């Protein structure tokens, strides 16, 4: 259930005019620096020549459960692997992407404990820690387009260190010299990549950092490496922790569950009651769209969680029901003007609305009261019990339609 998303030039011919990077994160589901960085890269950057292929989260089931790895460490499955391992097919997908001739370089993002130091200082600062280092398996890979891993790493590190927020965050090189006897790294992603004659790098951001600072350093590493590869790019923001925080916490982010209307990711009430979901559909099979790339649904006890990375956006208390798709649109008066409103849209209301009755369709305006049918009522903001709003701001309300005993669809009204 991982996806690969291309970031490419608008002109297809420009793909071959610069190198190709494979950018990967989220091989651990509890390393949000990485998969929030891949998410922001996908949402807010443009690649002008060459190609950057992105797998924003490698281990999505684990991400959804805020878990390091539900089926064990996925970054130890690139060497020997039982064919019955639940992640065997995923590993083959990842290996396939890595080994494609249209890839030159691989950058794997991680969040890691403490701060790496080449010599022991204390429990947080020592060679066994992983935070804030840029990592190679060896100094060179003969036969790669760009064999000089060490030079690339050193220059990328120099780029990152020109932008430190605090001096303790200084990046260091970590060469694991994997082929020489590092049996753990021999099982990991970048070493597989090396053996396909790809330049391969990993970037670690410290888990001791706030998410926004982790993402900041991940983006510095991505940009540093893109610069070394001479892959030209643009972003639509300034790279600082404040901007990163704002883009993670972006109020324009939405989730579209099934055929329901888009709902905002942020500032939802923490629980949405009697929430219609298609019956007889396993949760991972319920379609969900977003303008972000790390959104999904996951069962928790009797609830369905809406997740944004490791962030819990709301708890759905589901109402499982057949989704009848026959109703495409509903005639509504909005602020005096009659119009046809598509099922699954959000309509802004300044003053009032009125739903026209339909023969075999019942409308329930959630938060408005008199098998309720609430078509034929002129409804204003003052008529709502505000606690039924989707949003903390008390401005967004659900209108649900039923062709009993089936669910005919939903429309949101937003009072503006």
Ligand X SMILES: N[C@H](CCC[C@H](N)C(=O)O)C(=O)O
Q: Which does 359 bind (CB under 5 to 8 A by kind): Na ion, ligand X, Zn ion, none?
A: none
Distance CA 112, CA 96 (A): 26
- CA separation (Å) from 91 to 35, 94, 272? 18, 5, 36
Q: Is 245 annotated as a binding residue?
A: no
Q: With CB under 5 A as the contact rule, which of the stretches 10-18, 168-176, 262-270, 326-334 interacts with Na ion?
A: 10-18
Give which of 233, 298, 307 is closest to 268, Cα–Cα: 307
Distance CA 95, CA 390 (A): 42
Q: Could you list the residues that contact ligand X (CB under 6 A)? A: 75, 108, 110, 112, 130, 135, 185, 188-191, 202
Q: Which is nearer to Zn ion, 179 or 340 (CB)?
A: 340
Under a CB-based contact definition with an 8 Å cutoff, are residues 60 and 74 in contact? Answer: no
Q: Which is nearer to Na ion, 13 or 236 (CB)?
A: 13
274 SS3 class: strand
Q: How far is the CB of 365 from ligand X (least distance, A)?
A: 52
Q: Is 166 annotated as a binding residue?
A: no
Q: Is 163 annotated as a binding residue?
A: yes
Q: Which does 299 bind (CB under 5 to 8 A by kind): ligand X, Zn ion, Na ion, none?
A: none
Distance CA 98, CA 188 (A): 13
Q: Is 31 annotated as a binding residue?
A: yes
Distance CA 223, CA 229 (A): 10
Q: Which is nearer to ligand X, 133 or 260 (CB)?
A: 133
Does 197 interact with Na ion (rule: CB under 5 A)? no
Does 236 interact with Zn ion (rule: CB under 5 A)? yes
Q: Is 333 annotated as a binding residue?
A: no
Does 20 interact with Zn ion (rule: CB under 5 A)? no
- CA separation (Å) from 128 to 92, 121, 178, 306? 30, 11, 15, 36
Residues 149/7/295/309 CA torsion (nearest 10 deg):
20
Distance CA 195, CA 99 (A): 9
Strands 271-278 and 311-321: what pairing? parallel
Distance CA 251, CA 322 (A): 31
Give which of 209, 183, 197 is closest to 143, Cα–Cα: 197
Q: Which is nearer to Na ion, 15 or 403 (CB)?
A: 15
Q: Which is nearer to ligand X, 144 or 297 (CB)?
A: 144
Q: How far is the CB of 412 from Na ion (least distance, A)?
A: 42
Q: How far is the CB of 2 from Zn ion (least distance, A)?
A: 16
- CA separation (Å) from 196 to 74, 104, 142? 19, 10, 11
Q: Which does 236 bind (CB under 5 to 8 A by kind): ligand X, Na ion, Zn ion, none?
A: Zn ion
Q: Which does 179 bind (CB under 5 to 8 A by kind): Na ion, ligand X, Zn ion, none?
A: none
Distance CA 313, CA 64 (A): 12
Q: Is 340 annotated as a binding residue?
A: yes
Scan residues 16-35 and list those touching Na ion (CB under 5 A). Answer: 16
Q: How far is the CB of 140 from Zn ion (least distance, A)?
A: 25
Does 13 interact with Zn ion (rule: CB under 5 A)? no
Q: How far is the CB of 237 from Zn ion (least distance, A)?
A: 6
Q: Is 28 annotated as a binding residue?
A: yes
| Residue from the set 4, 14, 30, 44 that interacts with Zn ion by CB under 5 A | 44
Q: Is 140 annotated as a binding residue?
A: yes
Distance CA 78, CA 21 (A): 19
Q: Which does 400 bind (CB under 5 to 8 A by kind): Na ion, Zn ion, ligand X, none?
A: none
Scan residues 166-205 and list those touching Zn ion (CB under 5 A). Answer: none
Q: With CB under 5 A as the contact rule, which of the stretches 8-16, 39-47, 238-246, 398-406 interacts with Zn ion?
A: 39-47
Give which of 247, 254, 286, 293 is closest to 390, Cα–Cα: 254
| Residue from the set 4, 5, 14, 15 that interacts with Na ion by CB under 5 A | 15
149-161 vs 211-229: helix crossing angle, rounded to 10: 130
Q: Which is nearer to ligand X, 133 or 363 (CB)?
A: 133
Cis peptide before 405 (omega within 30 of 0): yes
- CA separation (Å) from 48 to 8, 108, 230? 7, 22, 11
| Residue from the set 28, 59, 62, 186 that interacts with Zn ion by CB under 5 A | 28
376 phi, psi to nearest 5 deg: 85, 10
- Please tell me the count of residues contacting Na ion according to CB under 5 A: 2
140 phi, psi to nearest 5 deg: -145, 150
Q: Which residues are documented as binding site?
A: 28, 31, 44, 110, 139-140, 163, 236, 340
Q: Which residues are documented as binding site for Zn(2+)?
A: 28, 31, 44, 110, 139-140, 163, 236, 340
Binding site for Na ion (CB under 5 A): 15-16
């Amino acid at each position: 259930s991982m996806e690969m998303i291309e970031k490419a030039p608008t002109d297809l011919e420009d793909r071959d005019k610069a190198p190709h990077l494979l950018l990967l994160a989220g091989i651990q589901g509890d390393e949000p620096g990485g998969f929030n960085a891949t998410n922001l890269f996908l949402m807010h950057y443009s690649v002008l020549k060459g190609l950057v292929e992105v797998v924003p989260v490698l281990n999505k089931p684990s991400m959804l459960r805020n878990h390091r790895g539900l089926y064990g460490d996925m970054n130890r499955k690139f060497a020997a692997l039982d064919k019955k391992d639940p992640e065997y097919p995923t590993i083959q997908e990842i290996k396939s992407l890595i080994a494609k001739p249209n890839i030159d370089a691989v950058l794997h993002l991680h969040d890691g404990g403490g701060y790496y130091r080449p010599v022991y200082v204390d429990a947080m600062l020592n060679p066994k820690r992983w935070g804030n280092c840029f990592i190679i398996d060896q100094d060179e890979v003969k036969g790669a387009k760009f064999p000089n891993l060490l030079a690339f790493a050193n220059n990328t590190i120099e780029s990152i260190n020109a932008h430190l927020l605090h001096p303790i965050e200084e990046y260091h090189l970590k060469n694991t010299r994997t082929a020489q006897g590092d049996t753990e790294m021999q099982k990991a992603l970048t070493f597989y990549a090396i053996n396909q004659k790809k330049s391969a790098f990993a970037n670690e951001a410290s888990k001791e950092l706030p998410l926004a600072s982790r993402v900041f350093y991940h983006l510095q590493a991505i940009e540093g490496l893109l610069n070394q590869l001479n892959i030209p790019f643009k972003r639509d923001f300034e790279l600082n922790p404040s901007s990163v925080h704002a883009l993670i916490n972006d109020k324009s982010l939405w989730a579209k569950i099934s055929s329901l209307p888009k709902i905002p990711l942020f500032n939802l009430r923490p629980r949405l009651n009697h929430f219609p979901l298609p019956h007889n559909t396993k949760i991972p099979q319920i379609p969900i769209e977003s303008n972000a790339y790390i959104v999904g649904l996951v069962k928790n006890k009797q609830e369905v969680f809406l997740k944004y990375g490791n962030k819990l956006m709301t708890r759905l208390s589901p109402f499982y029901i057949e989704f009848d798709p026959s109703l495409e649109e509903v005639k509504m008066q909005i602020d005096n003007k009659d119009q046809m409103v598509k099922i699954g849209s959000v309509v802004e209301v300044k003053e009032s609305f009125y739903i026209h009755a339909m023969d075999n369709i019942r409308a329930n305006v959630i938060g408005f009261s008199v098998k309720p049918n609430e078509a034929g009522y002129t409804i204003r903001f003052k008529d709502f019990q505000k606690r039924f709003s989707l949003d903390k701001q008390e401005r967004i309300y659900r209108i649900e339609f039923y062709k009993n005993n089936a669910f005919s669809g939903m429309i949101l009204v937003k009072f503006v």
